Design an enzyme around this catalytic site. Structure first.
Site, PDB file in Angstrom:
ATOM      1  N   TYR A   8      40.700  35.948  34.671  1.00  0.00           N
ATOM      2  CA  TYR A   8      41.752  36.882  34.273  1.00  0.00           C
ATOM      3  C   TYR A   8      42.263  36.489  32.889  1.00  0.00           C
ATOM      4  O   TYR A   8      41.745  35.553  32.278  1.00  0.00           O
ATOM      5  CB  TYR A   8      42.892  36.859  35.297  1.00  0.00           C
ATOM      6  CG  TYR A   8      43.889  38.001  35.183  1.00  0.00           C
ATOM      7  CD1 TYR A   8      43.477  39.326  35.293  1.00  0.00           C
ATOM      8  CD2 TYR A   8      45.244  37.751  34.969  1.00  0.00           C
ATOM      9  CE1 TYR A   8      44.388  40.372  35.190  1.00  0.00           C
ATOM     10  CE2 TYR A   8      46.162  38.790  34.867  1.00  0.00           C
ATOM     11  CZ  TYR A   8      45.724  40.100  34.978  1.00  0.00           C
ATOM     12  OH  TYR A   8      46.623  41.136  34.881  1.00  0.00           O
ATOM     13  N   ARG A  14      47.960  40.580  37.637  1.00  0.00           N
ATOM     14  CA  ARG A  14      47.336  40.983  38.890  1.00  0.00           C
ATOM     15  C   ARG A  14      46.552  39.867  39.554  1.00  0.00           C
ATOM     16  O   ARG A  14      46.079  40.031  40.679  1.00  0.00           O
ATOM     17  CB  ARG A  14      46.385  42.146  38.652  1.00  0.00           C
ATOM     18  CG  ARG A  14      47.062  43.435  38.253  1.00  0.00           C
ATOM     19  CD  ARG A  14      45.994  44.447  37.969  1.00  0.00           C
ATOM     20  NE  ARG A  14      46.470  45.816  37.848  1.00  0.00           N
ATOM     21  CZ  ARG A  14      46.847  46.589  38.862  1.00  0.00           C
ATOM     22  NH1 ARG A  14      46.884  46.125  40.122  1.00  0.00           N
ATOM     23  NH2 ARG A  14      47.213  47.850  38.603  1.00  0.00           N
ATOM     24  N   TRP A 104      51.103  49.561  30.999  1.00  0.00           N
ATOM     25  CA  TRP A 104      50.926  48.206  30.468  1.00  0.00           C
ATOM     26  C   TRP A 104      50.077  48.146  29.199  1.00  0.00           C
ATOM     27  O   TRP A 104      50.388  47.380  28.290  1.00  0.00           O
ATOM     28  CB  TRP A 104      50.294  47.304  31.532  1.00  0.00           C
ATOM     29  CG  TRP A 104      51.158  47.127  32.730  1.00  0.00           C
ATOM     30  CD1 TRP A 104      50.924  47.593  33.993  1.00  0.00           C
ATOM     31  CD2 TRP A 104      52.418  46.452  32.780  1.00  0.00           C
ATOM     32  NE1 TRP A 104      51.955  47.240  34.827  1.00  0.00           N
ATOM     33  CE2 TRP A 104      52.887  46.539  34.107  1.00  0.00           C
ATOM     34  CE3 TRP A 104      53.194  45.776  31.832  1.00  0.00           C
ATOM     35  CZ2 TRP A 104      54.099  45.979  34.510  1.00  0.00           C
ATOM     36  CZ3 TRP A 104      54.400  45.212  32.238  1.00  0.00           C
ATOM     37  CH2 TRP A 104      54.838  45.322  33.562  1.00  0.00           C
TER      38      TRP A 104
END
Ligand SMILES: Cc1cc2ccccc2c(-c2ccc(C(=O)NCCN3CCOCC3)cc2)n1
Ligand SMILES: Cc1cc2ccccc2c(-c2ccc(C(=O)NCCN3CCOCC3)cc2)n1
Ligand SMILES: N[C@@H](CCC(=O)N[C@@H](CS)C(=O)NCC(=O)O)C(=O)O
Ligand SMILES: N[C@@H](CCC(=O)N[C@@H](CS)C(=O)NCC(=O)O)C(=O)O
Ligand SMILES: [Mg+2]
Lengths: 197, 198
Positions: A8, A14, A104
């Protein structure tokens, strides 16, 4: 114990729900954080072109909540019954739906939309959660589940943009305190890279 | 159990639940509400959203949470724990995309603009990814149909209303739709259900 590699950005986002689960279950993993600048050629390599992904023994999994659910199957984080699992699933999707509404990856439309969601939807979500929780220690059943983890995680990010989110919801603050008091989670929180999001 | 499904009179986010009830041959009240009644019912709901499923006096919400609950221990669930992860993953990827559409937008020019951007710019990449993920296999996950196959057919039926050429370069995805529609319980539900656009 199989070999896990989480990929990530360098942020909670997330991936953080997966990271809480690993920390709580004391499962060793590789926490691979990529640079914003490297996201182009990484993205084209992935089957569905999004992160987080979790590689398990050379098999690439995707979708943060599909992964979270898989990792908590047969643990004390899952919820005791098929019905409880439904509640865990529903609460998590309710939080996820709301967070997903924020643009976002947008710049002046971004600020308007953030304020729309934070002024209109957020207090309503907060009141609904407080009502849904009403009286119980935990969101589902009589012990902690990964829904409680997700509440703590999503609410931490929402408080960045709306510091007064929970000023009138002490019972939802109590749930955040309860998650943060779990030694494995408290430990992760103090050790994780400090990021805004 | 006494089941009562509450949603709008449309396929929408309730249809996956309706397919599962039909496939498992389970009786339920298919409660369809008008828009004018929506203010009065909304205040009763757990998080102000539909669909909800009432089960022996208890209320469940969230269509996929409910769908997953209903398919636990049935042949529509993945055959293994990791297959179940693949099913969830495919379902969430589909739902994510569908959730980007402004279905409740009251300004039709804005709605149409956003619909056109998503269908021409984003949809083709997702169709490519799903086709590649399927490859030559019969079903999206494992040896047999799962509720991810149901959700592909449900979501693509709606997307095809607004972009008929969506699967022109993806015949294997169109065959997957035909196989789901051919499942007898599903076939009969498609005949039984109220005919709505969405
Ligand atoms: C805890 C949590 C939960 C979320 C649930 C749904 C959607 C987003 C969620 C997020 C989230 C996800 C992403 C961001 C976020 O900041 N995304 C921008 C991506 N950056 C990549 C590097 O270059 C700059 C752009 C912020 C918040 N966090
Ligand atoms: C099959 C499927 C899947 C979906 C997945 C995510 C989000 C929306 C989805 C939808 C969907 C959901 C809602 C609509 C839709 O038309 N929504 C409008 C809601 N009401 C407005 C007032 O009058 C009554 C109707 C259209 C499509 N369908
Ligand atoms: N529902 C998915 C969403 C995945 C997702 O859209 N992640 C973002 C990062 S927060 C992403 O990869 N977007 C950047 C891109 O599409 O290139 C999940 O939870 O994993
Ligand atoms: N992720 C949720 C979405 C629930 C949802 O937002 N449903 C819409 C109808 S399709 C709704 O209740 N919106 C009407 C409103 O907010 O008043 C689910 O799948 O159930
Ligand atoms: Mg979702």
């Amino acid at each position: 114990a199989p070999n896990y590699k989480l990929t990530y950005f360098n942020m909670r986002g997330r991936a953080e729900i997966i990271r809480y689960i690993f920390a709580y279950l004391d499962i060793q993993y590789e926490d691979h954080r990529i640079e914003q600048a490297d996201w182009p050629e990484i993205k084209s390599t992935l089957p569905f072109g999004k992160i987080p992904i979790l590689e398990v023994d050379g098999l690439t999994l995707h979708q943060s909540l599909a992964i979270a659910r898989y990792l908590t199957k047969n643990t004390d984080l899952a919820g005791n019954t098929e019905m409880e699992q439904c509640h865990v699933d529903a609460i998590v999707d309710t939080l996820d739906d709301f967070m997903s509404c924020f643009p976002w990856a947008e710049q002046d439309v971004k600020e308007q939309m953030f304020n729309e969601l934070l002024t209109y939807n957020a207090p309503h979500l907060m009141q609904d959660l407080d009502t849904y929780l009403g009286g119980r220690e935990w969101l589902i059943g009589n012990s902690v589940t990964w829904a409680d983890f997700y509440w703590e995680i999503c609410s931490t990010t929402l408080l960045v943009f709306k510091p007064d989110l929970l000023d009138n919801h002490p019972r939802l603050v109590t749930l955040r305190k309860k998650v943060q008091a779990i030694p494995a989670v408290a430990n992760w929180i103090k050790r994780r890279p400090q990021t805004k999001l």
